[PDB]
Design a protein around this ligand. Structure first.
Ligand SMILES: Nc1ncnc2c1ncn2[C@@H]1O[C@H](COP(=O)(O)OP(=O)(O)O)[C@@H](O)[C@H]1O
Ligand SMILES: Nc1ncnc2c1ncn2[C@@H]1O[C@H](COP(=O)(O)OP(=O)(O)O)[C@@H](O)[C@H]1O
Ligand SMILES: Nc1ncnc2c1ncn2[C@@H]1O[C@H](COP(=O)(O)OP(=O)(O)O)[C@@H](O)[C@H]1O
Ligand SMILES: [Zn+2]
Lengths: 49, 439, 67, 443, 97, 434, 151
């Protein structure tokens, strides 16, 4: 039946993120927040390129 | 010739408790024979299970090896029937490497509370007359279409929706298919082809047996009763799209916050009348396998309002509780033994032994003379009852191999010479005492 | 469509008649053979220095020795 | 050739059709009453009537209690599942002891399920959509069907197909002179590769070429497939089709044995009944054979109490060499044959006896003529005496090194001197242990 | 640590085809009997969990093509009871289920 | 000068296991001494391994510490040679943290059966000289070089797509299996190793290939049965051959591989080479793992087992019971036992000379005399440890041939058990626990 | 199209032009490098790092999200002999499991946790066979060390 799925986390936190004080470093966490290549992103999101 | 998956096993002849409506045991009925005191008690707790008002009540069935503890446990399983959950556990099965003991018992408990749901839905059940699917020349993808369905009485046209179109085309639906569509679920299902439109046809698109065209009105109701345990409600809720875990058993040590929340929402579905709750039975066979850690879980698990009626069985005397030094009755701590009622079984007479062998021979399709029953009754008192129950089929097979129609006394004396009683093997183990290892 | 007269597919005028028909190539009876006149072998590759079809180092020497 | 092993001569129980046992037949000798008992067990297994009824073979080391349990498999032949174990198989790291027993209880039951395969296959000679000269209203042109020309070594045929096929024949990157197949029971189409006739139109091209299919363009057969219920248990518990992230993740992750629920067993039982009732599926209740059963512990044994009773279970054969041992997983509980008295109560016991010198000599002769060996009478009459002084396995196991030594010394049969030379080079368990007792301080 | 790796396509070729002995055991011998070439095997070891995923996705495509070839013909032995073929170690398709 | 990764170990003085055609032992040959009866028995099992006709044979090699049990087993492994499996494990290698004792033994058996396969190939191997393509489908050509030839291929469309996905350049060295159509780079030709000033982390330099460009041959592969079992365990199972990260292979796979490998042998397509499994110090296998050998010695493709052990009548691990060798009686009559014997003084001289021949050391016959007495008054393996130290003391002494004064010095510096335990008693309560 | 990329470099000590392999230029684009950045190239290894934007461009905008660094006072080009120490265990580890293959810049390397594993016997056989090949070519030399077992 369409209604047995009714439990929930009481709390849902944001995944932790490492701030860093460097212009080269902040591109790396940006790339990770996007998903680190369009190949790997499409691979999980839609299954294969 | 035909042979189904379930066959003739050690309790297949038992079909109930054989009680009258006044709750007295008949001398021989529903496959149970003799054993009046324990059958009477089993009847009372069966009536308490059908009543279901009271939580965490428990029973321990005790007495000699081979005296119908498990017979009475199966007797009440068949008397309770398929609509109410009965979980059989041999006590060793909780020693998982995937999960701890208190988890394995909490699962065995919650597998034994049923939540029963009527799913009532409207279905269309028809034979496809024709389909049109319309697809844009490139566009954003705003597909559209029409479908037509028939019965031996009535037919109609449906203007199709966007998600319907992908569910139809996913299952290669075509003219001449017979299909059963659920209006609430949005799901198709295929019953076969009708004999008609499959003639206007190509090199093969499918190969299956045809089905007769559906009758009566094209739109009709369906009803299903689900029997969903608390354990599988907890597992489905443990991780999204977790539905395969019900089969693979791979979900270990489920979050307490799931059980706390499902205990509330299952009460709400009772107060809404949306679902029935049907508390059942947990039969922990050979319970003297549980550690004192596990018995101390049962002390405080067996006091939840969601607890099933719990039945132990055991054959042990004063023996030490598994995982400790301490001697106690039945191999159980008095911490637990104080909490549950004990049902006492008894040894068997000639009359009971012969009557058990006779009802067993009936279920195994065997004819034997009263002389062969006389010697087998002697064997079932000179030796334990299960050995006599093990000569019956062997004697029927030796009788068959010499092309006899009925087992004679010398067919049993032949088989008795051929397959040993423990008491005779443990005697021959004295002549070869230098040759067997590690005495 | 699918119907009592079987299936049909249909395109509005100006959609590409997109089922472009496909038909078999018509190759030579013999496969290409080695250029050395004593050699019965298929062409494996051709010489870069002279352009002849060849089948082996034996034929590569025997060719390049006489150009 | 195939290579010889410790049971390769055991071809059957060698009974008369009266059920009595011959002195020596089907590669066995002696144990007559225990072979007669195994005869009743073969009839029991062939009958398909029963569930969970079980036997223990008990007797000293090297008396034949594995050879008889294999002879039962030979009398049944390849068609019924016979599933072997040692008791020591149960101690997996992945999964609980009782589940390793429950899976082997499900290996010993087989479906035999028969189905048709039908397929169209061949080199695609042309793809030819066929139009209707009248279109339907408002549309430029319309197709009733596609013709696919297919070729095989037996001939060429124009198949007619519904126009939805052409969409899939540009998901598959098909071109004329590919070889392709279409599942006649399903309508699916697949590409195998360019046909081998074209394996010369370039000196290199990036595909392995496929030889032309042989037989007709349309192929049909029946196949009688067989699966154990344990194969159904695993295939349902861990699906293998890859069109979702749970399956791909679950297939890149390490494979793991998992504690399959009594619910999956239940649902598979409910559906194999649906097909057995319809005559679609045959069923073969098989045999589970456990050797070294004394290696199971009291938790295993106290699970076998349920499993041997259960109305689904296979016929079970146990073997043990033990005396009155302590049960594994208990401190000091001595019990006959190393098995708890309340499991030993649930099984028939078959007593397996020691051999006399003449029977050992007769076994050694039956070994030699199947190990590929010729022996002189003065060698055999010494080797049966060595077996009398020592053990069956030792005196049998001396044959092939005696052959090696005889062949090195340039001769076609084992002589007396070769048997005693090998007996001088190789000690038995009894002669070895005496040296350990004499030299006690030096080990 | 990546140059001294035995997964380098140079060492795979030199292990696989340039051996001294008439019989000589060497690693990567199984790559003749699975559909994997030296550089594809090196790339599968060094590009990590993305190359794992693509080499998996292709293996499912290869499974349906293999199953047809494996189940609809029996032309004896490839040069009269001799010589195995590409993919012959992939037996995961022979199970009925 | 150039020290290889392998150097002088405890056994590396052996070069085989010396025997005549009659399997008669020589007194001193192939770096072994004495032990005549045990070497005959080792020879007879060695010929039985070479013939391979019968599965699941087992030898137990037994006798006192230092009497050469592993010296027979390693010498036998070299006399058998390569080209036939010899899995050697110490008994305690089977107690894995991820798979049963059943599995670690099963894999040790299955890793010791070699299947030989013939495989037929043509493969291109050369330096790519240039690539040309044009647009009308596509058309192109490319040139390959080897030291013997420069040659051209008029490659097809999928190949042009594949090369332009691999981005190959003039001066790369590449290989293509012509039957399979798969490209594989090896590196850049040495002549090209300067036209860049800074170069990619994955670049590597190789010589230009030689001989014919598209070599055509059949070849023989030997691959052990365990690898076929692992490859079939999961979709990418071959990664686990190296990663070690596999265990508990489903029995349905192993019995399928028996049927298929027997079938290939009947079809003539493959041949089975039975190897050896050597379990050094078998005595510490647990009772459960000993009982598993009682069925694994019976499979019609088991290896031979060779078990070394060093124990008197002793408690079997995991039980109360005592038995010969620490091995259960129900396995001991499936075994066949080969017994060593202690060395005479006359033999002990020859083994010490053989170690000094291996280490490249020279000693007075006085020093061999005193060292032989030391190696007889205390265990042989202690005298085998004085010779290197005597050589290094001789170097520090600025000598060249070692002398009794060097032996007596090293004997004063490095103690054996018998002297060390004697001195331990004189200070016993200063040591911890008893 | 791209045989190589010419790159020009400047420091307070002078200038050079370098001819980059396309794999190194792919790394410059990985680091999002443009003209007027200050770059470190390790030409023997192919490592590339952006140090910052050169401070001659520090007035291109008054406030922009880049860090500016002074034009390097060091030489454009530097050489050393360096000697690398690597154990056979580092090879046994780094070649046994599939590598992460993902220089942070990815996301699949978030899912499968790294863990220790029972590295096979056979792989060590091949590491020994590759190391033998390299010490014969003189690219490496060997130092058998000591293992010291306390307690
Ligand atoms: N009262 C009974 N009526 C009929 N059959 C019985 C009865 N008591 C025992 N049996 C049968 O005899 C055998 C022994 O009973 P079982 O339940 O196995 O004994 P227990 O569990 O007490 O050890 C079984 O085959 C069972 O079906
Ligand atoms: N009755 C028999 N006839 C012929 N060979 C036999 C017979 N019984 C045993 N053997 C042989 O003797 C050896 C030991 O018997 P086996 O059953 O394997 O020992 P165990 O009883 O300890 O399990 C095997 O080689 C077996 O084939
Ligand atoms: N017969 C022999 N000839 C030559 N070297 C031997 C011989 N027997 C033993 N060795 C050497 O003597 C030492 C002890 O032998 P080993 O086999 O290791 O003893 P153990 O039987 O206790 O395991 C080792 O250095 C070994 O190589
Ligand atoms: Zn020629």
């Amino acid at each position: 039946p369409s209604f047995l799925c009714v439990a929930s986390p009481r709390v849902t936190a944001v995944p932790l993120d490492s701030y860093c004080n460097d212009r080269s470093a902040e591109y790396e966490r940006r790339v990770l927040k996007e998903g680190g290549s369009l190949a790997a992103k499409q691979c999980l999101l839609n299954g294969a390129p | 010739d035909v042979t189904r998956i379930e066959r003739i096993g050690a309790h297949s002849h038992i079909r109930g408790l054989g009680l009258d409506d006044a709750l007295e045991p008949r001398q021989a009925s529903q496959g149970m024979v003799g054993q009046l005191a324990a059958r009477r008690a089993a009847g009372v707790v069966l009536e308490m299970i059908r009543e279901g008002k009271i939580a965490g009540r428990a029973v321990l069935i005790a007495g000699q090896p081979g005296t119908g503890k498990t017979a009475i446990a199966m007797g009440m399983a068949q008397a309770l029937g398929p609509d109410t959950p009965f979980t059989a556990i041999a006590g060793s099965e909780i020693f998982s490497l995937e999960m701890s003991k208190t988890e394995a018992l909490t699962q065995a408990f919650r597998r034994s509370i049923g939540v029963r749901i009527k799913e009532e839905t409207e279905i269309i059940e028809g034979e496809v007359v024709e389909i049109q699917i319309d697809r844009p020349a490139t566009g954003t993808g705003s597909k559209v279409g029409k479908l037509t369905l028939k019965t031996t009485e009535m037919e109609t046209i449906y203007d199709l929706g966007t998600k319907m179109i992908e569910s139809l085309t996913k299952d290669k639906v075509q003219a001449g298919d017979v299909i059963t569509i659920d209006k609430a679920t949005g799901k198709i299902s295929k019953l076969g082809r009708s004999f008609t439109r499959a003639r206007d046809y190509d090199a093969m698109g499918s190969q299956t047996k045809f089905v007769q065209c559906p009758d009566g009105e094209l739109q009709k109701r369906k009803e299903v009763v689900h029997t969903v345990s608390l354990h599988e409600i907890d597992v489905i809720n443990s991780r999204t799209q977790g539905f395969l875990a019900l089969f693979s058993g791979d979900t270990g040590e489920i979050k307490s916050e799931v059980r706390e929340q499902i205990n509330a929402k299952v009460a709400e579905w009772r107060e809404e009348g949306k679902a029935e709750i049907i508390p059942g039975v947990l039969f922990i066979d050979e319970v003297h396998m549980l550690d004192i850690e596990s018995f101390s879980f049962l002390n405080r698990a067996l006091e939840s309002d969601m607890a099933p009626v719990l039945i132990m069985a055991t054959n042990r005397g004063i023996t030490r509780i598994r995982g400790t030094s301490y001697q106690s009755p039945h191999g159980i701590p008095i911490d637990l033994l104080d909490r549950l009622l004990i049902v006492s079984t008894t040894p068997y007479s000639e009359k009971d032994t012969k009557q058990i062998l006779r009802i067993r021979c009936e279920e195994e399709d065997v004819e034997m003379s009263e002389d062969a029953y006389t010697v087998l009754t002697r064997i079932g008192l000179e030796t334990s009852l299960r050995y006599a129950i093990q000569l019956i089929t062997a004697a029927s097979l030796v009788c068959r191999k010499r092309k006899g129609t009925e087992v004679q006394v010398d067919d049993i004396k032949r088989v008795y010479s051929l397959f040993l009683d423990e008491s005779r093997s443990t005697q021959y183990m004295k002549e070869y005492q230098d040759a067997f290892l590690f005495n | 469509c699918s119907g009592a007269q079987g299936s049909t597919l249909s395109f509005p005028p100006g959609v590409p008649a997109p089922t472009a028909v496909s038909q078999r190539p018509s190759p030579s009876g013999p496969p290409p053979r080695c250029s050395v006149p004593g050699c019965p072998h298929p062409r494996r590759y051709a010489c870069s220095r002279t352009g002849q079809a060849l089948c082996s180092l034996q034929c590569y020497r025997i060719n390049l020795q006489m150009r | 050739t195939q290579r010889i092993a410790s049971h390769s001569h055991v071809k059957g129980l060698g009974l008369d059709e009266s059920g009595l046992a011959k002195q020596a037949a089907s590669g066995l000798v002696g144990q007559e009453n225990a072979r007669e008992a195994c005869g009743v067990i073969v009839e029991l297994i062939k009958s398909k009537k029963m569930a969970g009824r079980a036997v223990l073979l008990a007797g000293p080391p090297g008396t034949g209690k594995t050879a008889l349990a294999l002879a039962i498999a030979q009398e049944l032949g390849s068609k019924v599942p016979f599933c072997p174990m040692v008791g020591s198989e149960v101690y997996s790291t992945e999964i609980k002891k009782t589940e390793v027993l429950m899976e082997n209880f499900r290996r010993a039951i087989g479906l035999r399920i028969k189905e048709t395969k039908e397929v169209y296959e061949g080199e695609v000679t042309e793809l030819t959509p066929c139009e209707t000269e009248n279109p339907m209203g408002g549309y430029g042109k319309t197709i009733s069907h596609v013709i696919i020309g297919l070729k095989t070594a037996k001939g060429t045929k124009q198949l007619k197909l519904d126009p939805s096929i052409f969409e899939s024949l540009q998901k598959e990157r098909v071109e004329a002179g590919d070889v392709i197949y279409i599942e006649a029971n399903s309508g699916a189409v697949k590409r195998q590769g360019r046909c081998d006739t074209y394996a010369t139109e370039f000196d290199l091209e990036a595909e392995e070429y496929v030889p032309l299919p042989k037989g007709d363009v349309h192929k049909k057969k029946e196949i009688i497939q067989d699966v154990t219920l344990h194969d159904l248990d695993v295939a349902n518990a861990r699906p293998q089709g890859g069109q979702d992230i749970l399956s791909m993740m679950g297939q890149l992750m390490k494979p793991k044995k998992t504690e399959i629920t009594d619910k999956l067993r239940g649902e598979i039982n409910k559906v194999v009944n649906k097909y057995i009732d319809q005559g679609i599926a045959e069923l073969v209740p098989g045999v589970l054979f456990v050797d070294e059963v004394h290696m199971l512990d009291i938790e295993c044994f106290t699970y076998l109490h349920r499993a041997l009773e259960s109305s689904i279970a296979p016929i079970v054969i146990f073997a043990s060499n033990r005396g009155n041992c302590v049960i594994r997983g208990t401190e000091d509980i001595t019990s006959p044959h190393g098995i708890p008295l309340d499991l030993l109560d649930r099984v028939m016991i078959i007593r397996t006896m020691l051999y006399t010198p003449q029977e050992m000599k007769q076994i050694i002769k039956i070994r030699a003529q199947t190990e590929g060996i010729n022996i002189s009478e003065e060698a055999l009459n010494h080797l049966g005496e060595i077996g009398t002084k020592t053990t069956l396995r030792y005196s049998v196991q001396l044959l092939t090194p005696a052959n090696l030594l005889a062949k090195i010394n340039g001769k076609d049969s084992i002589e007396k001197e070769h048997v005693e030379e090998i007996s001088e080079l190789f000690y038995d368990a009894k002669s070895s242990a005496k040296i350990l007792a004499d030299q006690q301080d030096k080990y | 640590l990546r140059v001294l790796s035995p997964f380098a396509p140079d060492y795979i070729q030199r292990s696989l085809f340039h051996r001294k002995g008439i019989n000589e055991e060497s690693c990567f011998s199984f790559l003749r009997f699975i559909d994997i070439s030296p550089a594809e095997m090196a790339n599968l070891m060094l590009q990590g969990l993305l190359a794992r995923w693509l080499a998996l996705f292709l293996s499912l495509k290869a499974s349906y093509r293999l199953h047809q070839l494996r189940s609809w013909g029996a032309p004896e032995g490839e040069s009269h009871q001799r010589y195995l073929r590409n993919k012959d170690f992939l037996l995961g398709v022979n199970f009925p289920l």
